Design an enzyme around this catalytic site. Structure first.
Site, short mmCIF file in Angstrom:
data_model
loop_
_atom_site.label_atom_id
_atom_site.label_comp_id
_atom_site.label_asym_id
_atom_site.label_seq_id
_atom_site.Cartn_x
_atom_site.Cartn_y
_atom_site.Cartn_z
N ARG A 34 0.88 -29.42 13.17
CA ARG A 34 1.51 -29.45 14.48
C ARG A 34 2.84 -28.70 14.45
O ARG A 34 3.42 -28.49 13.38
CB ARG A 34 1.74 -30.88 14.95
CG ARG A 34 0.47 -31.69 15.16
CD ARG A 34 -0.26 -31.27 16.42
NE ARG A 34 -1.52 -31.98 16.58
CZ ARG A 34 -2.64 -31.72 15.90
NH1 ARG A 34 -2.66 -30.73 15.01
NH2 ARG A 34 -3.73 -32.43 16.12
N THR A 46 5.12 -30.17 11.25
CA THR A 46 4.52 -31.34 10.62
C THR A 46 3.04 -31.13 10.29
O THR A 46 2.35 -30.35 10.96
CB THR A 46 4.64 -32.58 11.52
OG1 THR A 46 3.88 -32.38 12.72
CG2 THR A 46 6.09 -32.86 11.87
N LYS A 95 6.24 -34.02 7.11
CA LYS A 95 7.09 -32.97 7.65
C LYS A 95 7.08 -31.71 6.80
O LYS A 95 7.17 -31.77 5.58
CB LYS A 95 8.53 -33.49 7.80
CG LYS A 95 8.79 -34.21 9.12
CD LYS A 95 7.76 -35.31 9.37
CE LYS A 95 7.98 -35.99 10.70
NZ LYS A 95 7.07 -37.15 10.88
N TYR A 104 11.51 -36.24 15.83
CA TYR A 104 10.06 -36.25 15.68
C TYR A 104 9.38 -37.21 16.65
O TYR A 104 8.33 -36.89 17.21
CB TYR A 104 9.68 -36.63 14.25
CG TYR A 104 8.27 -37.15 14.12
CD1 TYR A 104 7.18 -36.29 14.13
CD2 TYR A 104 8.02 -38.51 14.01
CE1 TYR A 104 5.89 -36.76 14.03
CE2 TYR A 104 6.74 -39.00 13.91
CZ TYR A 104 5.68 -38.12 13.92
OH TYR A 104 4.39 -38.61 13.81
#
Length: 220
Positions: A34, A46, A95, A104
């Site tokens: 992502r 991430t 991460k 986040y």
């Protein structure tokens, strides 16, 4: 029989894991990456992975054995069974770039509240749960390699854990006791209105061969 490990940007997701919290064992259902599309470059932030408790195969076997990966992928009912099945799911966000907890958690909580409102299950109790959700992330910071674990219990609890690496913590940082919220996170990842389909494809590709065995046990 055979599940494989997935590595996203040097962050590995082993095929199988066992929780020091529950003592339960999970198999890797899927993993992806992502980030955000900023300017003319896509920046990874991430890695995300979804684990299903081992008993999930036997649970899904009755309805979904025999179906091809192509058919599962286009079937919402299949992912609803995964999301709301009578088994534990474990989601690990690792991460790639450093992010504070609030940084986040912002987009995740937005997606959750968005869905909860969408399906008419966002009352006072759910609001408090998302507030408690937020609080748990605030005192945390995630350097590269650090991880968040979402433990979705089928009993309507969401356990949150934070780790400096990819290992499962011994204790959980918080327990959010709310049925609607408990499944909210996974819904935003593989639910109908989940934007990125990479995890759905992973699940569609990996489950059929396993369902053919009718069951999964760690180390057999």
């Amino acid at each position: 029989a055979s599940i494989t490990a997935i590595t996203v940007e040097n962050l590995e997701y082993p095929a199988v894991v066992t929780s020091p919290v529950t003592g339960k064992s999970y198999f890797l259902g899927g993993a992806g990456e992502r980030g955000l599309t900023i300017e003319g470059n896509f920046i990874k932030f991430t890695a995300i992975g979804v684990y299903l408790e081992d008993i999930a195969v036997a649970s899904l076997a009755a309805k979904w054995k025999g179906k091809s990966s192509e058919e599962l992928l286009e079937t919402l009912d299949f992912y609803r069974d995964i999301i709301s099945g009578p088994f534990e799911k474990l989601i690990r966000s690792s991460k790639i770039r450093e992010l504070s907890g609030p940084e986040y958690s912002r987009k995740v909580m937005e997606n959750c509240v968005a869905h909860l409102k969408s399906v008419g299950t966002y009352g006072d109790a759910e609001a408090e749960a998302m507030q408690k959700f937020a609080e748990a992330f605030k005192p945390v910071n995630f350097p590269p390699g650090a991880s968040v674990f979402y433990r979705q219990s089928p009993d309507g609890i969401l356990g949150l854990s934070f780790s400096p690496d990819t290992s499962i913590p011994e204790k959980e940082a918080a327990l959010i006791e709310n049925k609607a919220v408990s499944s909210a996170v996974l819904e935003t990842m593989i639910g109908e209105h989940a934007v990125s389909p990479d995890l759905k494809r992973c699940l569609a590709a990996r489950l059929p061969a396993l369902l053919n065995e009718g069951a999964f046990k760690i180390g057999n």
